[PDB]
């Protein structure tokens, strides 16, 4: 179910999705609030994520750079061509 | 838990309006889903054009999901959820659609 990724501050880490199939709509959210998601093909990180993610347009997986600490915490994420969703729990290592 | 239980009537049409809402410009992603098969039917995406699964179901200005024709299968649980412009939870409510076969 939920996996446990940590991370270190400044750095950066990379959600992996096991799939298979190019699911092209996709949302991730880091609790109540999205990061990134892809509509019809296009493209949006909201907020701080800007500039600091890279979504990868086949594996769904997630891609967040230079951790803030204040980034520890729930992520998720969802999918039409799902099978029941995916929660990773970020853990903004210290250094 | 706080299913908003709502009383439909088989074979009319209803309306599942969202309380203390009121449509703002920061206003951009207003999504219905219907939780047990999970896949929305209806969204409406800032400037983008609504999308409807079946013409069963209808938006209204506010985020007013429309069933029309109510059926067996249109009893469900059904979840809004309301993102501003920064991809922020504006509100989060769930609807217990119980039609009664009168």
């Known amino acids: 179910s939920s996996q446990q990724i940590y991370g270190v501050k400044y750095g950066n880490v990379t959600f992996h999705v096991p799939s298979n199939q190019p699911l092209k709509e996709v949302l991730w959210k880091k609790q109540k609030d999205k990061v990134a998601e892809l509509e019809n093909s296009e493209f949006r990180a909201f907020s701080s994520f800007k500039n600091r993610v890279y979504l990868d347009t086949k594996s769904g997986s997630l891609t967040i750079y230079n951790l803030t600490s204040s980034d520890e915490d729930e992520y998720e994420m969802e999918s039409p061509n799902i099978t029941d969703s995916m929660k990773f729990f970020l853990y903004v290592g210290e250094s | ?102």
């Open chain 2, 1 to 102: 838990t706080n299913a908003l239980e709502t009383w439909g009537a088989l074979g009319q049409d209803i309306n599942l309006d969202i309380p203390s809402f009121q449509m703002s410009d920061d206003i951009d992603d207003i999504k219905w889903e219907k939780t047990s098969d999970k896949k929305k039917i209806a969204q409406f995406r800032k400037e983008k054009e609504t999308f409807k699964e079946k013409d069963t179901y209808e938006l209204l200005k506010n985020g007013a999901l429309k069933i029309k024709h109510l059926k067996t299968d249109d009893q469900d649980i059904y979840k809004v959820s309301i993102y501003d412009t920064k991809g922020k939870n504006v509100l989060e409510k769930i609807f217990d659609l119980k039609i009664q076969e009168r």
